[PDB]
Amino acid sequence: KLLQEKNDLFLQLESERSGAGDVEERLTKAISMKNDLEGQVQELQERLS
């Protein structure tokens, strides 16, 4: 039973790490997307000039 609290706290932890696993991919995908949107912006302004 003491170990079952250790079991659940560890199952949980792993699911927040795996939620953050999602968030790893999600985050870096959003960062890479920013840099393309930058390249969409900066130049399109420059083509106005």
Binding site: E24, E25, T28, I31, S32, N35
Partner: protein, 733 residues
């Protein structure tokens, strides 16, 4: 005995101080402290005051006209060479300066300023860590326990075991302020008092009488110091890594285990050291101590000066050998529980890194695809790993180049190969010491006791030189935060603890803060800086890095010292941060490759398919070390953490920063503020120019102004009420 209590011998200061009348007719009442060059601050007398101007002479009698607000009021010798600093009254600068200079020089290094002591690193092996010192001190009644580090650790052990809250022990210092040597004495209290050490034989000199956990936890520190320590221009014994010791305590009193983390390692110095620095200690030991037999199987030269990753030459360490020190440490493996194979196996994976840089690439201009002129140099590496020779010497120059996801062979050009070979050395050493510290912890993990602790923030650095790179910056990046935790713990968390304990205290502060420069929370630290958000793109440089710091901090952030022009047009790129102990010059050109780490894939993948057990373990995922190329999806690593590229270590040093700092502010701190007396590495020499910067800058004047009334002894109310009770058989029945 005259406000002070009763003395002991050299361990204490001269604490049966006189009250020699001569000092007294000077308290009348217009003497002051004045700026001199020679001592620092000195004694002056107000003779005549011209309103806001003052004519004050000096000990030298030179009559000088001064402007009011400099005149620091005289604070007389009632407080000369006491054990604790506390009692000193007029805490303006001179009053503290004088008093510490002549403490160090009067043999007392470690001086009390409440709990958080001041220590001016002696640089010597002082015979005060004797078991005399550590036999009397078996949970001693602290007057016989005077200003040495055993009491500090006694007072930690004596609060903690009772009051059940987790603890820290944090020594700060600058370059070669003997950090490690100090922590060994924190541990040397613990290893000879509170544990099961059978003491009734009374030997003051060499004890060596159990417990075995004590004899083991000690030996892991030489083992750590042979491998991870090397030398610098300032510092002979330069721990080229930064560790954290979690000293564990069980249910009943005595030791339970010890968890050492490790932060960085200086793998970059392995190709060539700069100026008078020495290579990683373990190496030289293995060279000189090895015998005729071992010498063959390991592939040592008989002659010296061959070993091509030892630059400048063979430099010595003052007053130690290399050769007998091998035989000490090898048996400190035996004593830990290593096996007769694994002995040879750790040295096998260590010496190849001394070898490798022997591989001489040479220009054959028909193409420039150089290959290296020999085999011996490569074989003395190859055997000790027991990797496929037919792979190494082909595939290093001709690897299976992954094009996107398909595969095309390439021959590599001369310098890429030399560089990748130097890369192979820095790959081996980094991975192994990280393998080693865990495989050390495994023997000393709290084997069915309890993980209750003291965390020791033993990060070895803050070491100032002309060359400071990224390497220096990521070490210096904690040490900074440590001086920030000083502010956060000398004002703040000291008394925040008094507050939690609901004591008779008054919250008072002064105002010292780095947080208007340096980032403390893990995400501020994982916003710092133009390195994780941009290391993946081909056009970013250490030049745009400097320019984006110069956009994103300068003018409006007053703490950032800018370069003294190595930036207009032609940069090496330098900048500085206002860190307490010193404005430090950094260089930026390079950092990118130290935050990408580029080797050869095919060979380290084929090294994964290696032999010799330990040599193998050092390679893969499953725990998470190498498996080092191919493509984890596009994150920046790694494995944990992040995806693929080889490394990215600055983000992994986010991952452990969160977990460490979270603990640190929860676990109540003990501190020791170690300072250095001179530049020249010398024993006993103190310098006043240095000391005048340093005692201003370590938070010392301010850090007596509160911590004077702050308490250095701390234990528990139930025991102390119950151990006393009937002393008042008149008053309490």
């Amino acid at each position: 005995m005259a406000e002070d209590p009763d003395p002991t011998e050299y361990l204490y200061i001269s604490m049966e101080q006189k009250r020699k009348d001569q000092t007294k007719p000077y308290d009348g009442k217009k003497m002051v402290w004045v700026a001199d060059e020679k001592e620092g601050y000195l004694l002056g007398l107000i003779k005549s005051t011209q309103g806001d101007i003052c004519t004050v002479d000096i000990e030298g009698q030179e009559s000088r006209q001064v402007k009011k607000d400099l005149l620091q009021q005289v604070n007389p010798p009632k407080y000369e060479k006491c054990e604790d600093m506390s009692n000193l009254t007029y805490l303006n600068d001179a009053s503290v300066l004088h008093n510490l200079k002549q403490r160090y020089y009067a043999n007392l290094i470690y001086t009390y300023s409440g709990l958080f002591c001041v220590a001016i690193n002696p640089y010597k092996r002082f015979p005060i860590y004797t078991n005399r010192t550590v036999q009397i001190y078996k949970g001693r009644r602290r007057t016989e326990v005077p200003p040495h580090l055993f009491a500090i650790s006694d007072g930690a052990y004596s609060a903690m075991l009772a009051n059940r809250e987790n603890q820290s022990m944090l020594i700060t210092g600058e370059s070669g302020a003997g950090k490690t040597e100090n922590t060994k004495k924190v541990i040397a209290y613990y290893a000879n008092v509170g544990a099961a050490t059978p003491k009734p034989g009374k030997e003051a000199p060499t004890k060596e009488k159990k417990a075995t956990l004590e004899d083991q936890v000690v030996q892991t520190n030489p083992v750590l110091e042979a491998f991870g320590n090397a030398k610098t221009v300032r510092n002979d014994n330069s721990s080229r890594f930064g560790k954290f010791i979690r000293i564990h305590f069980g249910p009943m009193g005595k030791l339970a285990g010890a968890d050492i983390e490790t932060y960085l390692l200086e793998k970059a110095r392995v190709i060539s050291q700069q100026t008078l620095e020495r290579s990683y200690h373990i190496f030289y030991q293995l060279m000189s101590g090895g015998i005729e037999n071992l010498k063959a199987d390991l592939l040592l030269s008989d002659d010296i000066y061959d070993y091509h990753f030892v630059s400048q030459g063979k430099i010595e360490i003052p007053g130690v050998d290399d050769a007998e020190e091998l035989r000490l440490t090898d048996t400190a493996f035996d004593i830990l529980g290593f096996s007769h194979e694994y002995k040879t196996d750790v040295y096998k994976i260590t010496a190849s890194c001394m070898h490798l840089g022997e591989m001489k690439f040479k220009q054959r201009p028909r193409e420039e695809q150089a290959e290296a002129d020999g085999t011996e140099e490569g074989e003395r590496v190859a055997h000790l790993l027991g990797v496929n020779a037919a792979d190494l010497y082909k595939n290093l120059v001709k690897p299976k180049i992954k094009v996107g996801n398909e595969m095309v062979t390439q021959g590599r050009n001369a310098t890429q190969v030399s560089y990748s070979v130097g890369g192979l050395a820095k790959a081996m050493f980094d991975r192994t010491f990280k393998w080693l510290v865990k495989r050390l912890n495994e023997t000393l993990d709290t084997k069915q006791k309890r993980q209750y602790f003291i965390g020791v923030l033993d990060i070895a650095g803050f070491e100032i030189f002309d060359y400071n790179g990224f390497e220096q910056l990521c070490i210096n990046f904690t040490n900074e935060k440590l001086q920030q935790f000083f502010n956060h713990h000398m004002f703040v968390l000291e008394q925040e603890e008094y507050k939690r304990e609901g004591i008779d205290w008054v919250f008072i502060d002064f105002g010292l803060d780095l947080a208007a420069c340096i980032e403390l929370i893990e995400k501020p630290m994982g916003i710092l800086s133009i390195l994780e958000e941009e290391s993946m793109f081909p056009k970013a440089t250490d030049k745009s890095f400097q320019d984006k710091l110069n956009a994103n901090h300068l003018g409006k952030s007053p703490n950032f010292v800018k370069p003294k022009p190595p930036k207009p047009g032609q940069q090496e790129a330098h900048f500085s941060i206002a860190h307490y102990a010193g404005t430090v010059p950094y260089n930026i050109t390079g950092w990118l490759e130290k935050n990408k780490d580029p080797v050869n894939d095919t060979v380290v993948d084929q090294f994964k398919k290696g032999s010799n057990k330990l040599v193998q373990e050092i390679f893969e995922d499953h725990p998470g070390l190498g498996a080092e190329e191919k493509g984890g999806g596009g994150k920046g690593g790694g494995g944990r953490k992040k995806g693929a590229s080889f490394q990215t270590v600055s983000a992994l040093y986010r991952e452990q920063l969160n977990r460490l700092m979270a603990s640190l502010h929860s676990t109540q701190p003990h501190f020791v503020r170690c300072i250095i007396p001179n530049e020249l590495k010398q024993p006993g020499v103190i310098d006043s120019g240095l000391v005048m910067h340093q005692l201003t800058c370590n938070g010392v004047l301010e850090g007596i102004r509160i911590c004077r009334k702050g308490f250095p002894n701390r234990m528990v109310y139930p025991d102390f009420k119950q151990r006393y009770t009937i002393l008042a058989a008149s008053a309490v029945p």
